[PDB]
């Protein structure tokens, strides 16, 4: 009922990047930076002065960057790689601080809660990284048996939630339960790998997941009861999602055949908007630290910035 441009305000080349479902390639910094790993290397674009840098490239010939995420106040990157390393950069002084090496293949996905990192690998396996301490790896989560390909740290600090190849989706404590590291739910609904997961900003319990291909659903849980709010059908593969509080949405990417991003409203999930413009398969969503702009990196080798979500569109 509001108006909504139905075309990017911008477009920043993306050339070379991967096209692999699983990998999670760019992040939007509360400094208001994006890090977008294209092949061997990773760029920052500020998105205030249109400055670029590229950060890092990887010596070693056929490695690629596997996941990228910002620590909460922007100052720091950790980036996943194919060689199986969590680094952790200090972008203002372009080093880099770290070389984490617990997992034995590729780091996919990565999520911080503060100090805390955690990163998903190819093995099915998290780590839980403590980066301020000599032996980071601090905890091993152990509760997919393919890629975990999502990985999502609840605001509130509360909750885990991992996404996998093998079509689970756990829900893990902040805390070991004394049963060791045991998932509070799992839920097998999705019949397709769920790279999308993401927490509602405003309801500490509600989560949203989106699986791949073969099953092409949304749904929406509670995960203190662990109930199925709402299942719906996109008709594509949902490869990630994002929450808005400012009208209280939900934004999926989608691929084949429309390669669009839908906007839904929560918590009827009617669809308010399908934004098209890509001409391959979306890959990640990330959303700008004032919340009126997604971000959408595709396999065209392009990111759309929508402004899909401002206030007063006048």
């Given at each position: 009922?509001?108006?909504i441009?139905?075309?990017?305000?911008?477009?920043?080349?993306?050339?070379?990047?991967?096209?692999?479902?699983?990998?999670?390639?760019?992040?939007?910094?509360?400094?208001?930076?994006?890090?977008?790993?294209?092949?061997?290397?990773?760029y920052?674009?500020?998105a205030?002065?249109?400055?670029?840098?590229?950060?890092?490239?990887?010596?070693?010939?056929?490695?690629?960057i596997?996941?990228?995420?910002?620590?909460?106040?922007?100052?720091?990157?950790?980036?996943?790689?194919?060689?199986?390393?969590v680094?952790?950069?200090?972008?203002?002084?372009?080093?880099?601080?770290?070389?984490?090496?617990?997992?034995?293949?590729?780091?996919?996905?990565?999520?911080?809660?503060?100090?805390?990192?955690?990163?998903?690998?190819?093995?099915?396996?998290?780590?839980?990284?403590?980066?301020?301490?000599?032996?980071?790896?601090?905890?091993?989560l152990?509760?997919?048996?393919?890629?975990?390909?999502?990985?999502?740290?609840?605001?509130?600090?509360?909750?885990?939630?991992?996404?996998?190849?093998?079509?689970?989706?756990?829900?893990?404590?902040?805390?070991?339960?004394?049963?060791?590291?045991?998932?509070?739910?799992?839920?097998?609904?999705?019949?397709?790998?769920?790279?999308?997961?993401?927490?509602?900003?405003?309801?500490?319990?509600?989560?949203?997941?989106?699986?791949?291909?073969?099953?092409?659903?949304?749904?929406?849980?509670?995960?203190?009861?662990?109930?199925?709010?709402?299942?719906?059908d996109?008709?594509?593969?949902?490869?990630?999602?994002?929450?808005?509080?400012?009208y209280?949405?939900?934004?999926?990417?989608?691929?084949?055949?429309?390669?669009?991003?839908?906007?839904?409203?929560?918590?009827?999930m009617?669809?308010?908007?399908?934004?098209?413009?890509?001409?391959?398969?979306?890959?990640?969503?990330?959303?700008?630290?004032?919340?009126?702009?997604?971000?959408?990196?595709?396999?065209?080798?392009?990111l759309?910035?929508?402004?899909?979500?401002?206030?007063?569109?006048?």
């Amino acid at each position: 009922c509001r108006y909504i441009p139905s075309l990017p305000d911008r477009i920043l080349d993306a050339p070379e990047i991967r096209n692999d479902y699983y990998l999670n390639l760019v992040d939007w910094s509360s400094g208001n930076v994006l890090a977008v790993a294209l092949d061997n290397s990773v760029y920052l674009w500020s998105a205030s002065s249109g400055d670029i840098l590229q950060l890092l490239q990887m010596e070693q010939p056929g490695e690629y960057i596997s996941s990228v995420a910002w620590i909460k106040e922007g100052n720091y990157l950790a980036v996943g790689t194919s060689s199986a390393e969590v680094q952790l950069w200090d972008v203002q002084q372009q080093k880099r601080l770290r070389n984490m090496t617990s997992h034995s293949a590729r780091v996919g996905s990565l999520s911080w809660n503060s100090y805390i990192l955690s990163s998903g690998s190819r093995s099915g396996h998290i780590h839980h990284h403590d980066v301020r301490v000599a032996e980071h790896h601090v905890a091993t989560l152990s509760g997919h048996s393919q890629e975990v390909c999502g990985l999502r740290w609840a605001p509130d600090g509360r909750h885990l939630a991992s996404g996998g190849n093998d079509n689970l989706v756990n829900v893990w404590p902040s805390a070991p339960g004394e049963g060791g590291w045991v998932p509070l739910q799992t839920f097998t609904q999705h019949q397709g790998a769920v790279k999308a997961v993401a927490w509602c900003p405003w309801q500490s319990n509600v989560l949203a997941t989106g699986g791949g291909t073969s099953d092409r659903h949304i749904r929406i849980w509670n995960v203190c009861s662990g109930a199925c709010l709402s299942a719906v059908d996109a008709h594509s593969q949902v490869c990630s999602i994002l929450w808005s509080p400012h009208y209280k949405e939900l934004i999926s990417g989608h691929g084949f055949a429309q390669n669009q991003l839908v906007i839904w409203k929560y918590p009827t999930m009617a669809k308010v908007a399908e934004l098209k413009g890509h001409t391959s398969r979306v890959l990640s969503l990330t959303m700008s630290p004032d919340g009126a702009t997604v971000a959408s990196a595709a396999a065209d080798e392009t990111l759309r910035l929508w402004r899909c979500f401002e206030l007063d569109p006048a």
